[PDB]
Design a protein around this ligand. Structure first.
Ligand SMILES: [Zn+2]
Ligand SMILES: [Zn+2]
Lengths: 510, 510
């Protein structure tokens, strides 16, 4: 068996797994939108059976045989080639899937399910004491999983793991290590606190009460569809439906779906949430279809994915140019806007406020919430902090980073599901997406010409085409750090994000 | 390995296949309702990958090992026991799936796909000449499949095959043979022609033009939902959505879905079509959930399934009692009914008319369309008729059975897709469903008391509970012929259907 024959067998087998898994993607979409109230228990059973099948296919020893025969062949010598890109990822997933003992996968999966469902009810009850045993168990098995993965050799071509955490972080953000995040976030922290301090001393507005007037849900839907169409989302290849928790989900080429949630009495949630999910969807629709089902045709990381959602939510969607374009229409469709000026509205949708809850934070304060979760997760995995001491260390860092501290557990350390779901090394990606987005955006402006005037006329397609040629077309060919450097000429940095904020908020807050 | 251990292994393996297949059911639902216009090609690829997986699981040699160890064991000696019912079906599907050579399955699947897509365009063009080669090929491979299946021993406990056709018919209608259909349909034919002849000589009405006034689509939807709720469809366990071609589809316990099609200018299609699909759904919702995924928990045949759709479309839905109940509401919601009396409306929805097109036929003429297709299919498989001579033999039997003959191919021998899709031995089930339905209905009235008065007050739940205890609860425990006899005390017969028609139409047509 030549390396070419083995590469074909491996591509066919891996592509078939992706097709079967995408029926899982469809069922997950349906579970959150169309499913009958009484159909959930069966759906879970269906998902569980699919998961067993995929676990068999992802650990089939044939994958090792074929990989053994392809690796070191000429076919893969060029790291930039499709085959090298694919095999690099296939090897790394195979090795990680085979290295976890079933005993450990099963206990971890069970502990995360128990802690998630206990957390649903315990957060409204402010019940740390009863939640902690569940979180303690999830941490432990997560830590045990980290050690297993750490002891594997990293993928050929990437920075080695520096410490335990990196083995978790690498799953969500290939190639990203703590020793790169440290300087990145230190620079961001200093710049955000200085900018917050200047906003706090401004004595200017914003009139957020404008956003809490009435905004009929059905008019929000119609207005969001106009926005989706003008920005370039292909509605013939997607759809928009209501859900309890907005998400985007890619079913396959020609089928990328958005969901959102509207609030009769809050403009932001449904409009900017639709735009945020549109950004994700635009990435998925711009990936190269001839590589669907392979690593060359998959999104490269959560950071880059979040860079595309945040590009369209904030850098476009919350910009002066965007609203110069669409504010007249909004006054036509929303009675609560009849007596509202463009300047008031643009300032209102960009209000800044230190607050306890991350998922409600403005773009200036949001990333400080991520820093504290990062700082705590590193303390945990470095063995310097214990889950029992998490509530005090949480408020300590909320006071130093944001200048406000929780008075309870509900709106404090228990506010997010992530840790109960065993999502450690996940949070930094939210911030990486913001830093990447501004860095991409700055190069796009430098190559395309300033974009505010173009947005004001509704011309979004050149910037969209630019993100396709620079980012979406590449799939997983380049690790994020390398992709950022190929598009922008420099390694990931916080300065473009800070420059973007400093200019935008120097103008709004005088 | 005991027989008990083998039966458990076999139940676990077979139930898991059903769960994976039900993700196929979900994707098929989505393909006809929610899928984006550009997502079809991927969906087909997903369906194709699922089909390969299922084909592997359905022919896994382990099924033969486990069956070998269970068969002849005490566990299965009682033919009425769950294990016997299950193993009977598992063996028969395994043997039929293993007996078809891949060469033959692949050519047949290909020939049916080619002939279906060629038939879509060729029927509007009246293009027999170009369609015939495609149909000729599908017949041949279908005939070859019949011979393979015929040469297997029939399932222990059922009538032997009498001739080639029975091997096809048995797949759609377990245990049903041509030599039972012959007397059944001969009796039906004589009775329908006599009743048609009396209707034709009546000189009474019906005013069908009432049904072609306007009926706003959205009011049809709201009215159908009232009907669904009153008849006992569990909307918390289902849903109703528009589609191009109505169907029902069961995804799992708690999740049984209906689709329908409304016409602004034709009342019947969307209302009675919703009721027809509701009948299917009511069967699926009444199957016993603790046996989901096994033959004991599956619908037993297309005839019985169609008996439940036709029960609710016609025996309930087109009855005087039903409209005594719901006609006032219909006059409240439909302006075109303001000047219309109950007597006019009930006669209109029950109009009878010999016509060329089966899918538009009234309940008195519809089954004669099935007889001719049966007569032609038997001629083909007995080697007495050739596909080339099908257009003449078609019009000959349309003249003798219905007294009207097609003038072209479009609205003649090419009107239905079935033969191009290789659905031979399928059509008789439509009529078996009508005969069963009336036979069930007659026993229900004899045990429950006349139902017209109960319908007139909206009391549908006792009859629904009766169909659950008599039919739905049984799953596939009894072959249809045996199930009809356990519920009604007699073997399937045409007389209850004819008695039902004779009384209903003696009154409408004087
Ligand atoms: Zn996001
Ligand atoms: Zn039907």
């Amino acid at each position: 068996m030549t390396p070419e024959a083995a590469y074909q067998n491996l591509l066919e087998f891996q592509r078939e797994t992706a097709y079967l898994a995408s029926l899982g993607a469809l069922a997950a979409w349906d579970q959150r939108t169309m499913i009958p109230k009484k159909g959930h228990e069966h759906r879970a059973r269906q998902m569980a059976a699919l998961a067993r099948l995929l676990h068999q296919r992802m650990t089939d020893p044939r994958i090792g045989e074929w990989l053994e025969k392809v690796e070191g062949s000429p076919l893969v010598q060029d790291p930039l080639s499709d085959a090298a890109v694919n095999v690099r990822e296939w090897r790394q997933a195979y090795e990680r899937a085979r290295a976890i003992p079933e005993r450990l996968a099963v206990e971890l999966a069970q502990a995360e399910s128990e802690a998630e469902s206990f957390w649903e009810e315990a957060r409204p009850r402010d019940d740390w004491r009863g939640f902690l045993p569940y979180l303690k168990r999830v941490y432990a098995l997560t830590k045990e999983k980290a050690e297993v993965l750490f002891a594997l050799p990293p993928a050929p071509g990437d920075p080695p793991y520096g410490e335990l955490y990196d083995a978790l972080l690498d799953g969500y953000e290939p190639g990203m290590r703590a020793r790169e995040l440290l300087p990145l976030f230190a620079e961001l922290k200093e710049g955000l606190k200085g900018l917050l301090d200047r906003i706090l001393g401004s004595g200017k507005r914003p009139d957020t009460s404008i956003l809490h007037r009435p905004y009929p849900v059905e008019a929000q839907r119609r207005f969001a569809l106009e926005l989706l169409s003008a920005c370039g989302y292909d509605l013939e290849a997607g759809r928009l439906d209501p859900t309890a928790h907005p998400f985007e989900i890619a079913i396959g080429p020609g089928d990328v779906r958005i969901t959102t949630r509207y609030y009769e009495d809050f403009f932001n949630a449904g409009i900017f949430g639709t735009l945020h999910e549109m950004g994700h969807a635009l990435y998925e629709q711009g990936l190269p279809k001839e590589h669907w089902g392979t690593p060359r045709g998959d999104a490269v990381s959560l950071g880059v994915h979040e860079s595309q959602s945040r590009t369209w939510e904030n850098l476009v969607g919350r910009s002066l140019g965007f609203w110069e374009r669409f504010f007249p229409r909004a006054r036509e469709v929303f009675a609560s806007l009849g007596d509202v000026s463009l300047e008031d509205f643009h300032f209102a949708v960009n209000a800044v406020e230190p607050s306890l809850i991350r998922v409600e934070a403005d773009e200036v304060t949001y990333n400080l919430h991520i820093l504290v979760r990062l700082e705590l997760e590193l303390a945990l995995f470095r063995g310097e902090l214990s889950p029992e001491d998490l509530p005090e260390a949480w408020a300590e860092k909320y006071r130093d980073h944001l200048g406000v501290a929780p008075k309870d557990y509900k709106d404090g350390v228990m506010q997010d599901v992530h840790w109960a779901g065993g999502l450690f090394g996940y949070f930094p990606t939210y911030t990486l997406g913001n830093l990447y987005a501004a860095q991409f955006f700055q190069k796009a402006e430098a190559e395309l010409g300033p974009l505010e005037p173009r947005f004001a006329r509704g011309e979004f397609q050149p910037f969209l085409d630019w993100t396709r040629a620079r980012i979406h077309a590449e799939g997983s060919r380049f690790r994020p750090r390398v992709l950022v450097e190929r598009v922008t000429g420099e390694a990931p940095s916080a300065r473009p994000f800070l420059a973007y904020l400093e200019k935008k908020y120097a103008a709004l807050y005088g």
